[PDB]
Design an enzyme around this catalytic site. Sequence first.
Site, short mmCIF file in Angstrom:
data_model
loop_
_atom_site.label_atom_id
_atom_site.label_comp_id
_atom_site.label_asym_id
_atom_site.label_seq_id
_atom_site.Cartn_x
_atom_site.Cartn_y
_atom_site.Cartn_z
N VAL A 113 -22.81 -11.19 8.07
CA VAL A 113 -22.98 -11.03 6.59
C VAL A 113 -22.39 -9.59 6.25
CG1 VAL A 113 -24.56 -10.87 4.68
CG2 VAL A 113 -25.14 -12.57 6.54
N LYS B 277 -21.45 -14.43 3.65
CA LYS B 277 -21.98 -15.00 5.00
C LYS B 277 -21.03 -15.58 5.46
CE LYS B 277 -25.67 -17.41 6.90
NZ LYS B 277 -27.25 -17.87 6.75
N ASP C 41 -38.34 -21.19 8.99
CA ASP C 41 -37.92 -19.87 9.63
C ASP C 41 -38.51 -18.76 8.73
OD1 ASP C 41 -35.35 -18.10 11.35
OD2 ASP C 41 -37.29 -18.59 12.11
N1 LIG Z 1 -27.97 -12.01 0.02
C1 LIG Z 1 -27.77 -10.91 0.69
N2 LIG Z 1 -27.55 -9.96 0.34
C2 LIG Z 1 -27.76 -8.77 1.13
N3 LIG Z 1 -27.79 -8.96 2.37
C3 LIG Z 1 -27.98 -10.32 3.00
C4 LIG Z 1 -28.02 -11.18 2.17
N4 LIG Z 1 -28.18 -12.49 3.02
C5 LIG Z 1 -28.18 -12.19 4.10
N5 LIG Z 1 -28.10 -10.69 4.12
C6 LIG Z 1 -28.25 -9.63 5.44
O1 LIG Z 1 -27.86 -10.29 6.67
C7 LIG Z 1 -28.86 -10.76 7.38
C8 LIG Z 1 -28.59 -11.96 8.17
O2 LIG Z 1 -28.50 -12.80 7.14
P1 LIG Z 1 -28.84 -14.35 7.37
O3 LIG Z 1 -28.73 -15.38 6.42
O4 LIG Z 1 -30.20 -14.24 8.36
O5 LIG Z 1 -27.54 -15.09 8.53
P2 LIG Z 1 -27.77 -15.37 10.20
O6 LIG Z 1 -27.77 -13.96 11.04
O7 LIG Z 1 -26.66 -16.16 10.77
N6 LIG Z 1 -29.37 -16.11 10.45
P3 LIG Z 1 -30.49 -15.30 11.35
O8 LIG Z 1 -30.07 -14.05 11.81
O9 LIG Z 1 -30.70 -16.61 12.39
O10 LIG Z 1 -31.73 -15.22 10.20
C9 LIG Z 1 -30.03 -10.63 6.49
O11 LIG Z 1 -31.20 -10.26 7.35
C10 LIG Z 1 -29.78 -9.54 5.50
O12 LIG Z 1 -29.88 -8.39 6.22
#
Ligand SMILES: Nc1ncnc2c1ncn2[C@@H]1O[C@H](COP(=O)(O)OP(=O)(O)NP(=O)(O)O)[C@@H](O)[C@H]1O
Length: 326
Positions: free
Chosen positions: A32, A48, A146
């Site tokens: 992200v 993302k 989750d």
């Molecule tokens: N809309 C957003 N704005 C700012 N930061 C974001 C946003 N969405 C996600 N993030 C940051 O990125 C981190 C991880 O995003 P996420 O949607 O959880 O992707 P992921 O790492 O693939 N899934 P996971 O780590 O299993 O929960 C979040 O905890 C935030 O710190």
Amino acid sequence: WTDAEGYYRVNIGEVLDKRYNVYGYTGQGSNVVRARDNARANQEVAVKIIRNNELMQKTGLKELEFLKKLNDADPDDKFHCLRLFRHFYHKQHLCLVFEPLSMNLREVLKKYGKDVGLHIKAVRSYSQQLFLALKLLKRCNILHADIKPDNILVNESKTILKLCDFGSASHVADNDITPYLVSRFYRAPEIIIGKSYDYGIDMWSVGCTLYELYTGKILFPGKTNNHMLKLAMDLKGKMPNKMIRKGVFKDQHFDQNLNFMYIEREKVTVMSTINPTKDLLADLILPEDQRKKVHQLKDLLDQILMLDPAKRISINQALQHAFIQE
Ligand SMILES: Nc1ncnc2c1ncn2[C@@H]1O[C@H](COP(=O)(O)OP(=O)(O)NP(=O)(O)O)[C@@H](O)[C@H]1O
Ligand SMILES: [Mg+2]
């Protein structure tokens, strides 16, 4: 350009979809990134970048449809779910454009201090917003699967929260018989036992989060699925006999006489009755106005943390609870 695992090697200053100028990080290995939209007067956005491979791309497209469904169902944005702006492809990776947000709830608790937690007024506002997210989740046929401080994001002023990360989300008609669904500490007893589950798993996860938001400590920090049941029974007592029989993984935790088998070099101990030893009130706890609110949170947690999802407090009753209404 793509890693062996399937991750995208991001570059600071790179322009995505000929408009999104990447300027900073948020979390790498889906990655992200923070970007400015040159096509929309340099407005802040969060991009993302979904992992390549085969299984991760399937969850990315699954995340796309669930976010679109929740956004269309909430046009005025009053049900506190993350807003998806649009999607594009970049070097084989699916990229989701999101509304910009400050930090996740795990990050804010770290800034609050070692076992400090948020102020009771903030926990009150956050609970109502989280219960509103459950309402939209239930209105649509979606299970988040989750809900935890890491997956709840807050704005700059920390007044508005948004439920994020729909990567592990699923439809209610889909009943995957797995005891590893939901992050272990926020996992409902019906998942572990192998009982038919619904929106109650997301309610349970909210309850675990609400205790953590005020105390700064994890409610049930269980090492395994068996230890999770023991910690859950340390608060409410042994699981009802009618609930144990309805499960699939009954034999893995309970014997023929419906007694719990606690694992502690294997070490198995048979337990006929589990006495409620954990005191929520002692763990949660100064002024009379704040003290009355902590007691109201305690009663709300008692109603959420029921082992049987049929005896669990509903979304409407949680929103109408004394802790929220004041
Ligand atoms: N809309 C957003 N704005 C700012 N930061 C974001 C946003 N969405 C996600 N993030 C940051 O990125 C981190 C991880 O995003 P996420 O949607 O959880 O992707 P992921 O790492 O693939 N899934 P996971 O780590 O299993 O929960 C979040 O905890 C935030 O710190
Ligand atoms: Mg991550």
